[PDB]
């Protein structure tokens, strides 16, 4: 299958005036960075509210997906459905991203940006969609796979999913952070996969990305002891082939060098007193 070529970007998408939106829109960068990590007990329950959302939307674009389908409809439903439950599409307008989510098929590590480019029997799919809703953000992503997919590529999404999965499962109180990448490239490595080191999952609360960086991959010298209260994305790309990649002249869309594809999946978690909830589910 051809390597991929940028789309046509449809018009920007309106959303109803009431719906609040966050305070980057519209400004070339965002007031964030510097926020607490641990959450109050109030942002986390409005966290829930925000992840539902998104885990809803996630999960109507997820169904979309299909040969034949551009990957703008998947925007276009996605981004309906955050309007329609009342959350602002955290990524229409965040640092001049253009849509409400982001599409990468293949070779696109992530950031890809929903355009005309039409999904062909057998590629693969990442949607990320994020809710703003009650002032604070809900992240997550899924790959989806279309038509009749070729096994290395259902078992790179599969294994993707698990690594994901586990490094969940570790997430508690009193454990290092850096257990994450640590859980997450040893699964990967057994099975020849290569994790993405240059983009890493990120506290997330009242903003978007909050300061706080997950590592996906083995680093040791992080310091950080995950505690109660405690809200970040864990996010693995995992890559087929080398990590090179390029990063096309629209500016977000990256892809790898040699081609071969990448899966992602994500979540937004809450360190609990004894362990994790993941608030990114229906
Ligand atoms: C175009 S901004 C996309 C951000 C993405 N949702 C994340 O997990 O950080
Ligand atoms: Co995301
Ligand atoms: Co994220
Ligand atoms: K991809």
């Known amino acids: 299958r051809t390597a991929l070529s940028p ?10 005036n009431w719906i609040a939106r966050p305070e980057y829109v519209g400004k070339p960068a965002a007031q964030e960075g510097s926020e607490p990590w641990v959450q ?33 409809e ?27 989510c982001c599409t990468s098929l293949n070779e696109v590590i992530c950031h890809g940006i929903p355009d005309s480019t039409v999904i062909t029997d057998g590629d693969i799919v990442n949607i990320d969609v994020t809710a703003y809703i009650g002032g604070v953000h809900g992240d997550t992503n899924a790959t989806f796979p279309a038509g009749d997919v070729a096994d290395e590529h259902r078992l790179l999404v599969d294994r993707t999913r698990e690594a994901t ?9 009193g454990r290092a952070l850096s257990v994450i990448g640590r859980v997450i490239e040893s699964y990967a490595n057994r099975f ?24 996906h991959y083995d680093q040791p010298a992080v310091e950080t002891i995950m505690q109660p209260g405690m809200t970040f994305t864990i996010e693995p790309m995992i890559n087929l082939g080398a990590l090179d990649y390029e990063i096309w002249d629209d500016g977000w869309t990256v892809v790898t060098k040699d081609r071969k594809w990448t899966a ?11 362990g994790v909830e993941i608030l990114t589910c229906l």
Do not use: C, W
């Not at 018009?11 to 109803?16: A, D, K, L, N």
């Open 7 to 16: 789309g046509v970007l449809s018009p920007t998408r309106p959303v109803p």
């Open 40 to 72: 109050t007990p109030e942002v986390i329950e409005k966290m829930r509210v925000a992840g539902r959302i998104a885990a809803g939307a996630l999960a109507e674009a997820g169904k979309a997906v299909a040969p034949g389908v551009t990957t703008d």
């Open 74 to 100: 998947l925007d276009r439903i996605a981004h309906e459905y955050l309007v329609d439950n009342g959350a602002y599409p955290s990524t229409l307008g965040y640092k001049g991203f253009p849509k409400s």
């Open 165 to 173: 999965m586990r490094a969940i499962n570790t997430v508690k109180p």
């Open 192 to 215: 020849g996969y290569n994790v993405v080191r240059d983009f890493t999952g990120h506290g997330i609360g009242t903003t978007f990305h909050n300061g706080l960086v997950v590592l």
């Open 264 to 274: 992602q999946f994500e979540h937004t978690l809450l360190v609990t007193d004894t």
